[PDB]
């Protein structure tokens, strides 16, 4: 049967970014590791088996893989390595993807938009955009 995570389902490539760089920087990403992930190009394989969504990430700099129920906090490892507790949830039809590590936070959006998946990632008062398209 259909879910309303269906739309996020696929094989999603960045295709471009804004303010990634400041971002990085507010959660206290170091010179080189900002540099070294700013260049990729990552491939992202969003699949859902049952409740169990996995978005399994794959790029030139770190390869990641997470497994989540909707509404349930998890482990996470970062990609910069912070090891946070996160919740994904929706909202409407909105990915809601909130981090939670020493006191901070930072969350990510994900959102269909066209043939796109747009994700927003705000930390303080810093707002990213990562466009994807479709792979
Ligand atoms: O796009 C990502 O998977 C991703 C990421 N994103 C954040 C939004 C949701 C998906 C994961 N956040 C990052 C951060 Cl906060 C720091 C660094 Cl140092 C690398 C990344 C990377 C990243 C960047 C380049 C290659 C691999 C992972």
Same mark, same amino acid.
């Given at each position: 049967?259909?879910?309303?995570?269906?739309? #996020?389902?696929?094989?999603?490539?960045?295709?471009?970014?804004?303010?990634?760089?400041?971002?990085? !920087?507010?959660?206290?990403?170091? #010179?080189?590791?900002?540099?070294?992930?700013?260049?990729?190009?990552?491939?992202?394989?969003?699949?859902?088996?049952?409740?169990?969504?996995?978005?399994?990430?794959?790029?030139? #700099?770190?390869?990641?893989?997470?497994?989540?129920?909707?509404?349930?906090?998890?482990?996470?490892?970062?990609?910069?390595?912070?090891?946070?507790?996160?919740?994904?949830?929706?909202?409407?039809?909105?990915?809601?993807?909130?981090? !939670?590590?020493?006191?901070?936070?930072?969350?990510?959006?994900?959102?269909?938009?066209?043939? !796109?998946?747009?994700?927003?990632?705000?930390?303080?008062?810093?707002?990213?955009?990562?466009?994807?398209?479709?792979?």
């Amino acid at each position: 049967g259909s879910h309303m995570c269906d739309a #996020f389902v696929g094989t999603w490539k960045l295709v471009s970014s804004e303010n990634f760089d400041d971002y990085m !920087k507010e959660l206290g990403v170091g #010179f080189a590791t900002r540099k070294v992930a700013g260049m990729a190009k990552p491939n992202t394989i969003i699949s859902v088996n049952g409740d169990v969504i996995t978005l399994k990430t794959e790029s030139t #700099f770190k390869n990641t893989e997470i497994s989540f129920i909707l509404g349930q906090e998890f482990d996470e490892v970062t990609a910069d390595d912070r090891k946070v507790k996160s919740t994904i949830t929706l909202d409407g039809g909105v990915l809601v993807h909130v981090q !939670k590590w020493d006191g901070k936070s930072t969350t990510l959006k994900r959102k269909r938009e066209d043939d !796109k998946l747009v994700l927003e990632l705000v930390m303080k008062g810093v707002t990213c955009t990562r466009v994807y398209e479709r792979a």
